[PDB]
């Protein structure tokens, strides 16, 4: 049951959290650096 | 060390909160005394004759 619910709700949780909480300017730059280093 | 943390304050903050919680737990489980334990053990033998 947990896997079945999660595979559909985890993206929903991500979207809802992103929308409710604005990424701080400082947070954004570290995300870009990490993504560039990891791809 | 410093260079790593200058760019990610959240990691340093998390470490600080962990240390704070550890210290609180240490306080809760610390006995209270006037002085540290300096008493040495003594054995007394009692005989009757
Ligand atoms: C009583 C004395 C107290 C001394 C103060 C210590 C307080 C505890 C702090 C522990 C902090 C652990 C996290 C450190 C992360 C460092 C990452 C550095 C990244 C680069 O440079 C490779 C990185 C090494 C991994 C960390 C090693 C774990 C330490 C235990
Ligand atoms: C017993 C005999 C006496 C013993 C006393 C020992 C006391 C030593 C405590 C000294 C703590 C000082 C903290 C300095 C942080 C590291 C210094 C590096 C600059 C890039 C590398 C990152 C380094 C990660 C190391 C994580 C730090 C955890 C400590
Ligand atoms: C970020 C900075 C955070 C700093 C917060 C520090 C608070 C630490 C309190 C932790 C704690 O457990 O103290 C309890 C309050 O006791 C007390 O009576 C505390 C007296 C002093 C309160 C204010 C201290 C200055 C700040 C003792 O709890 P306990 O009764 O179990 O201790 C007897 C053990 N046997």
């Amino acid at each position: 049951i947990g896997t079945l619910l999660s595979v559909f709700l985890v993206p929903l949780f991500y979207v809802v959290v992103r929308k409710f909480f604005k990424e701080t300017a400082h947070e954004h730059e570290m995300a870009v650096r990490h993504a560039s280093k990891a791809g | 060390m410093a260079k790593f943390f200058i760019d990610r304050p959240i990691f340093a903050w998390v470490i600080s909160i962990f240390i704070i919680a550890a210290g609180i737990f240490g306080i809760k489980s610390l006995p209270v005394s006037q002085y540290p334990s300096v008493a040495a053990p003594t054995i007394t033998l009692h005989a009757i004759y």
Side-chain angles (χ1 to χ4, degrees):
Chain A
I1 290 168
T3 300
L4 181 72
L5 295 172
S6 303
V7 298
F8 291 136
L9 294 186
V10 165
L12 168 75
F13 297 166
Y14 182 88
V15 168
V16 169
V17 161
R18 287 297 305 185
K19 181 64 170 180
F20 194 96
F21 300 95
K22 300 300 101 190
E23 184 171 35
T24 327
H26 176 96
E27 304 184 6
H28 175 99
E29 79 185 353
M30 295 299 291
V32 180
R33 185 179 295 113
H34 169 85
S36 302
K37 267 205 73 154
Chain B
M1 270 275 290
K3 290 282 208 184
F4 174 80
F5 287 108
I6 281 169
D7 277 334
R8 50 209 90 198
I10 293 176
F11 203 81
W13 271 118
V14 165
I15 293 163
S16 282
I17 314 178
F18 269 124
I19 295 166
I20 290 158
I24 279 161
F25 262 72
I27 286 178
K28 297 296 289 183
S29 66
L30 265 169
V32 183
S33 179
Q34 174 80 48
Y35 288 100
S37 298
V38 301
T42 306
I43 295 91
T44 306
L45 309 174
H46 306 271
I48 301 299
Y49 186 70

